[PDB]
Design a protein around this nucleic acid. Sequence first.
DNA 1: GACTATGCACG
DNA 2: CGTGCAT
DNA 3: AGTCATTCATG
DNA 4: CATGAAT
Lengths: 482, 482, 207, 208
Amino acid sequence: NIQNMSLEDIMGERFGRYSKYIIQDRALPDIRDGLKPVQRRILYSMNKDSNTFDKSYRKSAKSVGNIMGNFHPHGDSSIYDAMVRMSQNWKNREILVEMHGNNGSMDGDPPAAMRYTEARLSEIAGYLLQDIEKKTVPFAWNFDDTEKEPTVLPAAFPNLLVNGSTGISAGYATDIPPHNLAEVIDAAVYMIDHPTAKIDKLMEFLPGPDFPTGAIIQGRDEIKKAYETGKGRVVVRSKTEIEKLKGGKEQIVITEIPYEINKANLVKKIDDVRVNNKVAGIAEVRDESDRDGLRIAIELKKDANTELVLNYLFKYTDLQINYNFNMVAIDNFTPRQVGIVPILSSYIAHRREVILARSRFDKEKAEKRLHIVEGLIRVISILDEVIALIRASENKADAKENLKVSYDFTEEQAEAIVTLQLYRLTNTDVVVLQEEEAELREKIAMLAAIIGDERTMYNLMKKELREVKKKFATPRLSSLED
Amino acid sequence: NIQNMSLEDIMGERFGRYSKYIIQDRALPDIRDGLKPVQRRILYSMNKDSNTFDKSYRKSAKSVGNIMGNFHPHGDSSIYDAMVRMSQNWKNREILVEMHGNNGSMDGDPPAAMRYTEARLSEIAGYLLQDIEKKTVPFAWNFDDTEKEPTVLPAAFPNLLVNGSTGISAGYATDIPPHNLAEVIDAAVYMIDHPTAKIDKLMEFLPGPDFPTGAIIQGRDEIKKAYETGKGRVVVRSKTEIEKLKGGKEQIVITEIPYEINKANLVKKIDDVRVNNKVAGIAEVRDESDRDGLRIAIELKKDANTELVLNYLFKYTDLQINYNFNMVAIDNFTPRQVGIVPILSSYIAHRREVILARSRFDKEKAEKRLHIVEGLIRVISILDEVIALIRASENKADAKENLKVSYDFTEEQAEAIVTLQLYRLTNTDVVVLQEEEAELREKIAMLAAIIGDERTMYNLMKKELREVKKKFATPRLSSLED
Amino acid sequence: KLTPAQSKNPAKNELYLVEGDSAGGSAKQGRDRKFQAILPLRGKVINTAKAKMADILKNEEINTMIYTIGAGVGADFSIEDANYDKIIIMTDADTDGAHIQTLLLTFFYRYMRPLVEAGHVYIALPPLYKYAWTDGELEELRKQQRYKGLGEMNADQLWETTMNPETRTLIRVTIEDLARAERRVNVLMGDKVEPRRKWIEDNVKFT
Amino acid sequence: KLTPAQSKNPAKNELYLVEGDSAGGSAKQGRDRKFQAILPLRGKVINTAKAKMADILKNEEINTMIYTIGAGVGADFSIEDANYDKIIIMTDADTDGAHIQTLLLTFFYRYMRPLVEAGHVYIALPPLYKAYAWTDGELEELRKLQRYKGLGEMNADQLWETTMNPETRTLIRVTIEDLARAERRVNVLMGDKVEPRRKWIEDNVKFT
DNA sequence: GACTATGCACG
DNA sequence: CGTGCAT
DNA sequence: AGTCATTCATG
DNA sequence: CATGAAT
Ligand SMILES: N[C@@H]1[C@H]2CN(c3nc4c(cc3F)c(=O)c(C(=O)O)cn4-c3ccc(F)cc3F)C[C@@H]12
Ligand SMILES: N[C@@H]1[C@H]2CN(c3nc4c(cc3F)c(=O)c(C(=O)O)cn4-c3ccc(F)cc3F)C[C@@H]12
Ligand SMILES: [Mg+2]
Ligand SMILES: [Mg+2]
Ligand SMILES: [Mg+2]
Ligand SMILES: [Mg+2]
Ligand SMILES: [Mg+2]
Ligand SMILES: [Mg+2]
């Protein structure tokens, strides 16, 4: 009827439970594909549903309900918020979801509700899912035990660094800024070739973070420190220009701001400086950003010290902020603070896993087929005796048994022969089949070599990473300064 | 550049639009299946997604998102609210959706949000959709032009009367009360035999409304009027009992209340009578209903006139109310005030079209099959000669020509022969095929007769209606008094 | 709720009355902040022909319009001190969109006649096909996505088609006949149901 | 927020703290109204060992509990002026339910110790599987299979038979076994400082 | 995840 | 007022 | 259909 | 103070 537990024990089995889950299955990204579980399910469900960059947009509510019912047993609003986020290109260096409609602004006004919006996987998102149908990655049972879901994605690009993550669980938090796709891949390629590469050298390829919001990142040293240990504090500062206006008045013009910074709040807080006269000099503050440009104009009074003003805003507003690296991720089911090296190496180990898996799978298909084709060719040699045998067999089973026993076909071949349609009997061309037999024998040799030879395999993985870079490469947005 | 337009003309055009749409495709039920468009789409969608009485509950949000993305371009909340209602057995005489979880209550407390609840079609909703796969009802394109939806369902029971409807558009409004399934079916069966039946005779089969909530309905005369003209006012009174209590005190107990009346509000309003002392003798009001029984206890004081109190409550609260029939429905695309006869007859006309369509569809399957089977019976006697004839042909098309030219098979028979799998040559059993032929000839004769004779078809309707009554009949809940 | 235009100017500034918060956002984003303001209407607007003038003054949607348009109401209404030269009604191009226009129009008629009488009240025509507004213009672009509402378009999409004063079209509501309009608004929006029912039976073809 | 029991009775009245308005509905309907009250907590309870007593006093969820409990808070707390014999915490059988139980316990410990020291605080044990079973053990015998994701999934008639009915249910009765060994644990798991919590997690939680 | 206001007909 | 699909 | 408050780590 | 997945 009733049962006693101590306050000591009760607070253990409970916080233990929550702690574990929040760490493995909520707040922290997997080190390999760079996704938290909610994002993985969004991409996987959308992809299962054929909701891809090359097909019509699909109503958000439909995507969200499917995710909720099949994969992610939580609130629809959180799922949607996460979906929306992956579509905001001022928060993701490479957006994974393409969303038609009001998905928000840098001003942080609310996205249209899911009843109003439509969405689909972006083309690049496709590459995160590349080869998932080829048994390349481990699956688990969903919460319902009704369907299998992937525990990680194949990740044909290094999403963790490219898009970043953030980042608050229990006992742990995470902050990993986004990077330039091209730079990240260059490092990965160099590291495939030189596994023991040091950070200094890696940084000739991957010099630092690249925010979608651009701006200026300052502190080569703290960057080095973060790539080394996973923690570091760099400075991010707005891109500014001065503009002389008529009558001795100057004007400060902002064109880029720091990552994760809300434009409307920034502008307001700058205007608060003017209203409070915390510092003398400010005439007016204007947000002049339009549908195709970000432009904040801070007009100064005549004979006003524009150095003092700009310096004050840098210190007391978010015109300039500190950005703290705190690269934590899930490696081998546990949280790890990691620098650039573990990250790149975990990635490479993962691709290896995938490419091997991908290749075993394709090779198995080629084999099962080649095996059938070999039988068909043979059968043609003895058609009449084979039709007679089937004609004398009591049923499907008996016919297969007779095929094995009298002419040494295997089960798999027997089953293919016995389920041929009558019209096939009209064919007697062995050549076309022999051409297929040759094409398959070649494909199997290539695939077998990838699996048997570490270097052939690593070439493949370099070849593919370069194809991705050539396709999705965009220029740096953030400038680096020491 | 712009375009001028009169107020007179603009207001006219615009309101004409809202008016029309609200009348045909939002507020009022189709006279045949008794559904508003949203209700139809909920059912069609759930059914297309295999979400039926005999299979697991599916999470509501998944049901709703699919409905919204494929058929109903409106708020998710409206869709969910409609779905919820169809599952409430205090608003529906025969619930069409089964919902697991907090789906509301007679106290009108809110149902759990769509993220929490699970649902599926009830077994009876099944009968509303029966035969929809058989080309029995007109389909239209959805707002996408991606998918066809049904403009009406095949309705294998007269849902308009059984579950009722209500009902507010522009220029029109609708209130139709629920009815006992058996009674409604008894009436319809009578009217099939006696198309010109008058209300008086119908009312021996269908004496009046049967509310889910039970209680007492007073007014044979107004019922007749409602059944005749679509308008009428009846009285609905709660089911009561007096319990003797210790110390000479008595107790009024309410066990059934009137349709569409919020039990919680009723109890406050009654307790207001006591608090205000509007009638002498009420000691205390308590709601004692629990998960398996409704019960309101009105404990009276010692020397209290229990009649004075009961009568007052009936008059000045909602323990007794008026129900007004205002039976309006959509009939040939337009709104129509209607009594029992137009309803029942419209239903019968609809079932006729549905059964005729069904029967045409099944006949055509059976002929196509009969035709194949006739050829197969022939092929058996010439098995070897046919195999040889195929062996001798250069390919599929050639094999068919040879079969046609040499043995006078038709195209469709040649196609079927030539595409048999080899193992079928072991299943060389003519008698089993002759049984199938016989069974098909019989089936085709029955369906021909349905198609070619109005009375034979009407007998099929009566037979089917009786099966539904046998299967789903339940006792009256509402008692009648004149 | 109101998103102001940058500078004040009773001669250029326009007031877009958008149906819904969500499209109010797409519009906040799409607009030209220097002269276009945005005011979202949450929910169906109160029928100012049916409801008591008390429940009316008390309605939050109505009060915030009387203030932002900024000229008072009814008989104490000075066109002179208004804030906008163009009040633009912008709804989904669906049936509930039409209803909202209706409701608003009978409010400007009843309580701000001078504004509608000077041709200051417009209606924005969003496109229905994706660009072409009329089915006719449709088949003509197939020689060379059916929009269910405003929320379907992106901000750059909104501006280009319906908010950009150069590229847009607007139905400008002029009162042609004072008598024949008063009757039309009443049959349609007033207390009495019978006439309305009759008007529908006469004018609306249920094919 | 509170749905009270019909008759006021300190010796028998029960107070259900339910995680959520929706589940709080299933509880109103499922309950015996004579002596069982329902009080929905809307959202994660405030960590009373991390926030300032200022912000803790201004918390609606917290204030209505002191009010519905009726013994006031802190040192100005009479257990003799309480309104319930049993205060039952009823959360989903998921990780966030776990968390919520943890947050309420630290409140009832730091601010109503007497209530916890008198064995007056309990925790409902909702079922994990459905014949009904709690844990792997009871499923093996039932085999001789719907998995509950939350209180939301149970119809009000099941809720009663399985977890609200005094005659049919199981409750963990919370008890302070060692006041010292227990102060450390709440302070370490729920305290302001991260480093000790992180360590505790490292040492106790088995990631596998 | 509950709450807040409207339209529309009708007693 | 309160109903049920809408916004 | 926007809005309100809380966890958790962090500077 | 915010952040972003959670209730
Ligand atoms: N001046 C009125 C605002 C909106 N109110 C409500 N809005 C609801 C709803 C309920 C409301 F009280 C809904 O219930 C709803 C829905 O889709 O279910 C949408 N909405 C809804 C909300 C915002 C909007 F712009 C349009 C809507 F239809 C109250 C005050
Ligand atoms: N004392 C606080 C209640 C709840 N507050 C909010 N609740 C939100 C939310 C936001 C809230 F402010 C959400 O945003 C949300 C969601 O799923 O997105 C769920 N909820 C949510 C609401 C109720 C509940 F019981 C549990 C929840 F998680 C305000 C006052
Ligand atoms: Mg939320
Ligand atoms: Mg700063
Ligand atoms: Mg609503
Ligand atoms: Mg009465
Ligand atoms: Mg719309
Ligand atoms: Mg839960």
